[PDB]
Design a protein around this ligand. Structure first.
Ligand SMILES: [Mg+2]
Ligand SMILES: [Mg+2]
Ligand SMILES: [Mg+2]
Ligand SMILES: [Mg+2]
Ligand SMILES: [Mg+2]
Ligand SMILES: [Mg+2]
Ligand SMILES: [Mg+2]
Ligand SMILES: [Mg+2]
Ligand SMILES: [Mg+2]
Ligand SMILES: [Mg+2]
Ligand SMILES: [Mg+2]
Ligand SMILES: [Mg+2]
Ligand SMILES: [Mg+2]
Ligand SMILES: [Mg+2]
Ligand SMILES: [Mg+2]
Ligand SMILES: [Mg+2]
Ligand SMILES: [Mg+2]
Ligand SMILES: [Mg+2]
Ligand SMILES: [Mg+2]
Ligand SMILES: [Mg+2]
Ligand SMILES: [Mg+2]
Ligand SMILES: [Mg+2]
Ligand SMILES: [Mg+2]
Ligand SMILES: [Mg+2]
Ligand SMILES: [Mg+2]
Ligand SMILES: [Mg+2]
Ligand SMILES: [Mg+2]
Ligand SMILES: [Mg+2]
Ligand SMILES: [Mg+2]
Ligand SMILES: [Mg+2]
Ligand SMILES: [Mg+2]
Ligand SMILES: [Mg+2]
Ligand SMILES: [Mg+2]
Ligand SMILES: [Mg+2]
Ligand SMILES: [Mg+2]
Lengths: 58, 94, 80, 116, 136
RNA sequence: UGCCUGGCGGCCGUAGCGCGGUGGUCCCACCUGACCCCAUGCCGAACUCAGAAGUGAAACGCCGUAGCGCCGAUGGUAGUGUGGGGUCUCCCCAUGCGAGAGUAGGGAACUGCCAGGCAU
RNA sequence: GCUCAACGGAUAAAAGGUACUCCGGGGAUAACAGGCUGAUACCGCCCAAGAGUUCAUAUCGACGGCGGUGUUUGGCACCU
RNA sequence: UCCUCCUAAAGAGUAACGGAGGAGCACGAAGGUUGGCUAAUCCUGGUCGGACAUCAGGAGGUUAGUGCAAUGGCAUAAGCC
RNA sequence: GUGAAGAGGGAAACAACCCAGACCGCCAGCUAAGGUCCCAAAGUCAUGGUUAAGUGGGAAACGAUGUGGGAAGGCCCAGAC
């Protein structure tokens, strides 16, 4: 029901604590980890914040 | 008389204005009168040649956008700080 | 070798500022602002201390607002 | 000048009653007339009012700007306030001295039943 | 040598010199010497370039100086360790951004102003250019 | 309901100044007098009282007026959060936010409660 | 009732010398040398007011500017 | 040791043998309250009287004042009787 | 943020830079930065330009008919240079 695929494509080692908390909010754990989340503006805001290191699929 | 050809800007802001000045253009705006302000973009080398005359900043100019001539006057121009180039021009509808 | 200085001093930081911001529910007596002067002013249900400290006389939410002809900044407590 | 200094002289106690939430009696004094009105604690509407410009008060009098007129005004505004159920107010002198016609008015309102 | 007569304070932080300039257009005179590069000048560099264009015009015409050295520059003496207070004020500079008009000139022809401002820019560390007045 | 005026507010310069005009039935103001209430570090100037002959001169109110003050877009520019890059004292690219100053222009306030007067 | 002001105040009450010296430790910290840097120094260069009978550039070169070396005086304290 | 500003990066806080200044008190009224008042400076005229006392008017509108350093405040005055 | 307390791959070598966080095993596969003539794994790939300096593969003021591209200009078959 309006759900999208989010895939972590880069590492989170040297990243900010806020970006690591954003990946925790998305539930991404490792690279290539594809997760399936609903499509809200809050989700789109986390994807906006880490768009450099994720890949949103649809 | 100076006849200048223009196109309506599809997008605005810093990235667009930088990208026009990359591609040898520069934005301008026509305002004044009862009509809404119109965000145009110009070729730089033509207008840089045309503006060297004081006739440019005195006479009434014709701007063609979508084949629709608009008689204006040069209200204000923003120049590059140390290069002979133009950033932005204000046109007041005469 | 040689020299000296005359500019070594400074005082301790008094920790002023706004302790409770707007829309922030407080108890009666809670310090809202510590300040030197009346940079802010006391509005409804808000008292001004000896050192121009703004405290809440009642319970409720903090309301910042600009009133008066001089455009001075008033702090009031909305009821809650 | 005199009007402005009277307002400056009054605007401290007016703001004090403004933050006290006090229903407030406002006196205004002229050489010919004297005015009174009871104002809600919001300061935007009145409750009762009396003056020497009213016919029902001025026609019983010799001159509108003496102490006997001021006492008749404070009596009438007190009897209207108690008719409307307003009992406890706070007297705003409005930059005048508590003296003469103002004092005779407030003493008349105290005697007629207001409590201030 | 230009220098403030009074100052509220004797010393100043080193600061930075980023941003574009404001005195861009030729305001007063007809011809101008505009800075293109970035940096700091001094009262010596200013007065040497002023002498070189005053002599190049044979005191004909009028020369404005748009800049003024108001920033004090400290130095520590030789064989002094890095502590023990801020160094002593040695000279005065003016922070120069790109676009700042440094000098103006009129009463002379254009080619004479070109060769005068060229003799002046040869006394300056930063890269300059020649500009003229403009309507609007 | 209309007009005018007074009081108390709301709002806090699109509300303030300036310039010109205008108002006196009422209101207001000045104004007359003061042994008294009361007052002057002298003075009825002020404060206050008793009044109402005169005048709207001043003040005040109203109307007009863009000399200002004020307000003020659109676009652009500066800056900057994140990511990346370069020739790395400083800048650029993608993206998001986006001024200030200035311009066009606006603009000679708006509104509530009560009371009185004249009209209706 | 304490200029306990060395101001969270070692005691009511305390200055110095050691090239006659000694122990524990430190390259956490100095002197030598090395290192980084290159202010200074040295060597170049740019503009050219003038001097050079005239003539800036035969030789010099004011006012100012840009570099190089690591070579002096120094800075730091990374090795010992 | 203590106070004020900057450094301090628009909450707080934030170092250096960093940049600049002060404090180790005073007051029985210089406190409280009620009532009232509103400056600096300049211009003109005016006995001694003068750049500058005091007096009268006008501009200005706090550029003054705050027991003392600086900052923040202050006209409802926290300033002055 | 990393190292410290963190190995692996790259930057020739190079704690702190770039990519990326090692439970163990496999003579399996895909990729990151960075790379693909040989040392030394992978393009002597394709298409269109530039450079002649081994620039690349170390440096400024300044100097110069080096060379490529663009926009404009003033003389010119009444004959330009
Ligand atoms: Mg950007
Ligand atoms: Mg008028
Ligand atoms: Mg009188
Ligand atoms: Mg009049
Ligand atoms: Mg904008
Ligand atoms: Mg703006
Ligand atoms: Mg106005
Ligand atoms: Mg008006
Ligand atoms: Mg101690
Ligand atoms: Mg101690
Ligand atoms: Mg030993
Ligand atoms: Mg060591
Ligand atoms: Mg060590
Ligand atoms: Mg050594
Ligand atoms: Mg070196
Ligand atoms: Mg010769
Ligand atoms: Mg030579
Ligand atoms: Mg020299
Ligand atoms: Mg050596
Ligand atoms: Mg050395
Ligand atoms: Mg160290
Ligand atoms: Mg060694
Ligand atoms: Mg802070
Ligand atoms: Mg901060
Ligand atoms: Mg008082
Ligand atoms: Mg005098
Ligand atoms: Mg006091
Ligand atoms: Mg490692
Ligand atoms: Mg490695
Ligand atoms: Mg290397
Ligand atoms: Mg290796
Ligand atoms: Mg593969
Ligand atoms: Mg690759
Ligand atoms: Mg191979
Ligand atoms: Mg090939």
């Amino acid at each position: 029901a309006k759900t999208i695929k989010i895939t972590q494509t880069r590492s989170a080692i040297g990243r900010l604590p806020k970006h690591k908390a954003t990946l925790l909010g998305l539930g991404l754990r490792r690279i290539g980890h594809t997760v399936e989340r609903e499509d809200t503006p809050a989700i789109r805001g986390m994807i906006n914040a880490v768009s450099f290191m994720v890949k949103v699929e649809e | 008389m100076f006849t200048i050809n223009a196109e309506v800007r599809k997008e605005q802001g810093k990235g667009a204005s930088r990208r026009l000045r990359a591609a040898n253009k520069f934005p301008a705006i026509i305002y004044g009168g009862k009509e809404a302000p119109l965000a145009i973009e110009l070729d730089h080398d033509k207008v840089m040649n045309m503006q060297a005359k004081a006739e440019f900043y005195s006479e009434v100019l014709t701007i063609v956008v979508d084949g629709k001539e608009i008689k204006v006057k040069a209200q204000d121009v923003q120049r590059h700080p140390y290069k002979p180039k133009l950033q932005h021009i204000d046109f007041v509808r005469a | 070798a040689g020299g000296s200085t005359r500019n070594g001093r400074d005082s301790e930081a008094k920790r002023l500022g706004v302790k409770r911001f707007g829309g922030e529910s407080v108890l009666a007596g809670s310090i809202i602002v510590r300040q030197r002067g009346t940079k802010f002013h006391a509005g409804a249900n808000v008292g001004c201390g000896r050192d121009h400290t703004l405290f809440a006389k009642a319970d409720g939410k903090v309301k910042f607002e600009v009133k008066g002809p001089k455009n001075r900044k008033f702090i009031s407590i909305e009821a809650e | 000048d005199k009007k402005s200094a009277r307002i400056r002289r009054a605007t401290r106690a007016r703001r004090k009653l403004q933050e006290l939430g006090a229903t407030r009696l406002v006196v205004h004094r002229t050489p010919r007339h004297i005015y009174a009105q009871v104002i809600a604690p919001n300061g935007s509407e009145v409750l009762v009012a009396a003056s020497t410009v009213e016919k029902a008060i001025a026609e019983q009098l010799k001159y509108t700007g003496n102490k006997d007129a001021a006492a008749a005004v404070g009596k009438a505004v007190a009897e209207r306030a108690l008719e409307k159920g307003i009992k406890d107010v706070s007297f705003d002198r409005s930059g005048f001295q508590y003296h003469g016609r103002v004092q005779a008015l407030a003493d008349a309102a105290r005697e007629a039943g207001l409590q201030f | 040598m230009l220098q403030p007569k009074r100052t509220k304070f004797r010393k100043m932080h080193k600061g930075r010199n980023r941003g574009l300039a404001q005195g861009t257009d030729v305001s007063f005179g007809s011809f101008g010497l505009k800075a293109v590069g970035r940096g700091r000048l001094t009262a010596r560099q200013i007065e040497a370039a002023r002498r070189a264009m005053t002599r190049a015009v044979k005191r004909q015409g009028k020369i404005w100086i748009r800049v003024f050295p108001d920033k004090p520059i400290t130095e520590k003496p030789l064989a002094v360790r890095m502590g023990k207070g801020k160094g002593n004020v040695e000279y005065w500079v003016a922070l120069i951004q790109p676009g700042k008009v440094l000098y103006e000139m009129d009463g002379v022809p254009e080619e004479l102003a070109r060769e005068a401002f060229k003799l002046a820019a040869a006394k300056l560390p930063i890269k300059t250019t020649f500009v003229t007045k403009t309507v609007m």
